[PDB]
Amino acid sequence: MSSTPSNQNIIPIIKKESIVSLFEKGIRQDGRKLTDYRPLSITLDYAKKADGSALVKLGTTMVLAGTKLEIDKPYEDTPNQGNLIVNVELLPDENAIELARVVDRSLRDSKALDLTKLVIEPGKSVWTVWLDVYVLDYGGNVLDACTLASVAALYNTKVYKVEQISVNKNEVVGKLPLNYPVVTISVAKVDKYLVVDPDLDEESIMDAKISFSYTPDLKIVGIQKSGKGSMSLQDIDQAENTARSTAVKLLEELKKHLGI
């Protein structure tokens, strides 16, 4: 059963008009443009007992992603692939599940992580990558921060020596078979305006938002519409245009944080 959340904090018309009035001048409460991202922090290896981890601060949103690698028999429905299991927790479900799956899809479909290179003994043993993503501070646009946290954690992930049957956790053999990073860009429809990386207030007044996932060459790798409202054809057209030219900047910044 999926039902309309009864907890929503319905945000008065007067405050909404305030924000719209600013959009009309092409500026937001925090002072950024309609197409700007919030400030981005990435701290790698924040969670020491994780195989790889990342703390992401995007505005007031905080997400800690952490990886854990384990040896498993491959699933008999995918004999020459390792496993990726993505999991999201909100702390301040259903939204958690959506987030996990959207992030998953964008990592899997893009082949950003190559599962076929996680095979150890074909049909006998493969690597399972548990990716656990913890939303510590809900500041709006959680999805984009989750993607960034997940990608960063993966890139931070150390792979260990394999005693062949056993893992040796003090000899670091290498890293994950990663092809490229990926970014997800969310564009919110508010009134007649499109706004990139909506904050908490912006999310509560939006009609809907749409998230685009991109690879570095700028191929679209996932799309997810979100929210109780609708969006026009041309809104979506412009949103992806906007999303794409934002993706370039965000990818560059991500790479600086990762050490490319």
Partner: protein, 247 residues
């Protein structure tokens, strides 16, 4: 090395045709009937090719635990569910992560159409059951729901019509097979309130260039517009059959 032809099957074949003999711009056969459940407030069966869904609406009613109700709106309670015998291998009846997400996605889609403000402190129940899955079930479910709501006489901005548009062998195609979903480069379910040109559901799994995205998007509209007219007709006659044809 040289004998090793690939493993994925071709999806665009002789002439310009697909595994089921359709052209890239052709819908599957459509069947719609309304008021099929006597004890529901509204109901509908929807069929796109081999995808069958049934939807029941239990109309605006005071809500069981009141703290869960809303002071200004009706709460929508939506269930997307697949019967264990809808697929080839038996699906577990327990709700899957996929089923939970699609429940939400479909709910939000309906929330944008249904005039919930009209019924404060009430719940509208929408139960969907996929009887046969052949891809595009999330859309067939949403449309069946939309139509069951109209059958219940619940005021809405517009009806909802949808199709999965996709990419097969570099070719942009309309309304996907099981096979096309399972081996295609892209799968993009899109749903609208067609008269308003308002998009209600929008998802893409897979991969596309912006150009391909825009082309696919155009094709979905033409398909949606055809489906929409059939919905409209189903509303008057309670029963509609449509054999496959080109956009």
């Amino acid at each position: 090395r040289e004998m090793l032809q690939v493993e994925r099957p071709k999806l665009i074949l002789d002439d310009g045709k697909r595994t089921d003999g359709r052209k890239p711009d052709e819908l599957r056969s459509i069947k719609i009937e309304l008021g099929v459940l006597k004890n529901a407030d509204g109901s509908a069966i929807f069929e796109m090719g081999n995808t069958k869904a049934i939807a029941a609406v239990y109309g605006p009613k005071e809500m069981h635990p009141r703290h869960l109700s809303l002071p200004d709106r009706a709460v929508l309670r939506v269930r997307y569910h697949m019967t264990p015998f809808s697929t080839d291998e038996r699906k577990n009846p327990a709700p899957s992560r996929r089923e939970i997400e699609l429940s939400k996605v479909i709910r939000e889609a309906l929330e944008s159409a249904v005039l919930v403000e009209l019924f404060p402190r009430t719940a509208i129940d929408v139960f969907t059951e996929i009887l046969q899955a052949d891809a595009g079930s999330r859309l067939v479910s949403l449309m069946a729901a939309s139509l069951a709501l109209a059958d219940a006489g619940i005021p809405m901005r517009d009806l909802i019509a949808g199709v999965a548009v996709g990419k097969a062998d570099g070719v942009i195609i309309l309304d996907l097979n099981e096979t096309e979903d399972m081996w295609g480069e892209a799968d993009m379910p899109i749903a609208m309130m067609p008269s308003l040109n308002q998009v209600t559901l929008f998802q893409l799994n897979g991969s596309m260039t912006p150009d391909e995205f825009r082309q696919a998007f155009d094709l979905a509209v033409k398909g949606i517009n055809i489906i929409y007219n059939l919905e409209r007709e189903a509303l008057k006659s309670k029963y509609v059959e449509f054999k496959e044809e080109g956009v």
